[PDB]
């Protein structure tokens with residue numbers, strides 16, 4: 001089974017998921033001087049006021065907060081998108097040290113972590129159908145750097161000790177994901193893929209230029225999670241990121257100058 005170790009990590013994934021070598025894989029390095037400003041791109045519309053968080057889960061590859069996606073409660077619209085995308089979950093990728101952890105890079109710079117807010121296109125009715133479509137998902141990616149604390153992350157950090165090992169979950173209601181967003185919604189966008197198996201080429205990526213800052217204490221709590229299940233040899237959940245993949249026949253567009 002796939003993971004992030006020497007014998008099951010990203011360089012092995014293509015054996016079970018041959019699309020790993022496909023034409024629109026993620027993440028990628030964002031070369032800021034080569035991204036082209038597109039004046040036709042609209043502002044992103046992030047409408048999270050009615051979000052209903054449900055549960056937080058350690059799935060053995062990250063921790064995920066899930067939302068009620070049975071109605072248009074927390075939706076992403078505008079930007080490069082046509083139609084309405086419902087928020088299903090968010091999760092993070094992070095490093096063993098502050099100089100690595102992000103999936104996307106910016107002029108080869110790696111951030112300490114990366115937040116993925118995962119949304120699916122309501123025209124396909126459910127996320128399983130959306131993953132089989134080239135415009136099925138929109139993932140809003142937000143970089144994390146280490147410095148000052150992010151107060152809106154603290155409720156997440158404080159429950160992680162209850163989901164230490166793979167398969168554990170907890171009720172996580174009334175969490176407001178607006179507390180995770182930076183000031184600016186300036187973004188880069190490109191067509192890509194899921195960054196974990198099945199690596200489906202179904203994602204419009206929207207990566208925010210402005211990182212959020214989190215404290216060293218907050219990221220240390222991420223690094224105390226375990227990849228293993230309870231009772232198995234402890235392997236800290238760190239470095240759960242896929243490296244940048246070939247850009248191939250794609251242009252990254254910027255919403256800003």
Ligand SMILES: NS(=O)(=O)c1ccc(O)c(NC(=O)NCCc2ccccn2)c1
Nearest residue numbers: 116118139193194195196197198199203
């Ligand atoms: N990391 S990401 O590109 O935001 C992203 C977003 C939504 C997703 O469903 C995934 N992939 C994911 O959750 N995979 C779960 C594990 C799995 C599911 C199906 C087959 C093999 N492995 C990644």
Ligand SMILES: [Zn+2]
Nearest residue numbers: 091093116195
């Ligand atoms: Zn992700």
